[PDB]
Amino acid sequence: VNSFSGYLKLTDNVYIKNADIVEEAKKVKPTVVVNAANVYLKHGGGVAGALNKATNNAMQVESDDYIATNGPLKVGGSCVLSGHNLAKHCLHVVGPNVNKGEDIQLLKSAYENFNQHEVLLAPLLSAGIFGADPIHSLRVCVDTVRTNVYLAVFDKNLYDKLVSSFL
Numbered sequence: 001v002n003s004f005s006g007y008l009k010l011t012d013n014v015y016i017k018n019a020d021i022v023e024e025a026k027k028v029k030p031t032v033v034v035n036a037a038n039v040y041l042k043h044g045g046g047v048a049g050a051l052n053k054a055t056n057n058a059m060q061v062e063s064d065d066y067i068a069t070n071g072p073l074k075v076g077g078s079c080v081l082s083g084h085n086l087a088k089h090c091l092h093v094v095g096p097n098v099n100k101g102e103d104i105q106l107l108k109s110a111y112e113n114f115n116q117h118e119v120l121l122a123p124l125l126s127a128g129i130f131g132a133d134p135i136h137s138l139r140v141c142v143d144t145v146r147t148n149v150y151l152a153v154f155d156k157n158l159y160d161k162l163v164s165s166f167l
């Protein structure tokens, strides 16, 4: 038993809710919240900009030190940093950005990072401003992640379309 509430169960291990991931993180304080990161950990907009804003820019300060030490992430890669006031940890995961021409096949590699964590609160990778089809992202999620994932979808219209078209 965990504290996630109001989710629709899609599979044995994947759950979905129309929710603002920032507000959901603030309420649940999950062990892991996933950020929709880029390789530079520049949290300017989308999910990343919202999570960072909610940390009063502490996520960005920590991220800048991480990059100065380690260099950029790989597309499809991840790093674990603090969850600040939102979660114990933040798993920064880089899905491919279609608006940069990145290979969509890397979306599966991106989701594989979730398997290193027993339970996660997450957005749909490569959705939103990353330009991928969210229905496809959900399919890759279900077919790749084996750990327990609670997906927060900000847009109610998109949430209803994801549920209604889910196979």
Ligand SMILES: C[C@@H]1[C@@H](C(=O)O)CCCN1S(=O)(=O)c1c[nH]c2ncc(Cl)cc12
Pocket (backbone or CB within 6 Å): 020, 021, 022, 036, 045, 046, 047, 050, 123, 124, 127, 128, 129, 130, 152, 153, 154, 155, 156, 158
């Ligand atoms: C897939 C989501 C989708 C959702 O999950 O409802 C709705 C719009 C597109 N994006 S987005 O790229 O991540 C995004 C852009 N700005 C944002 N600000 C805050 C938050 Cl929480 C998410 C975003």
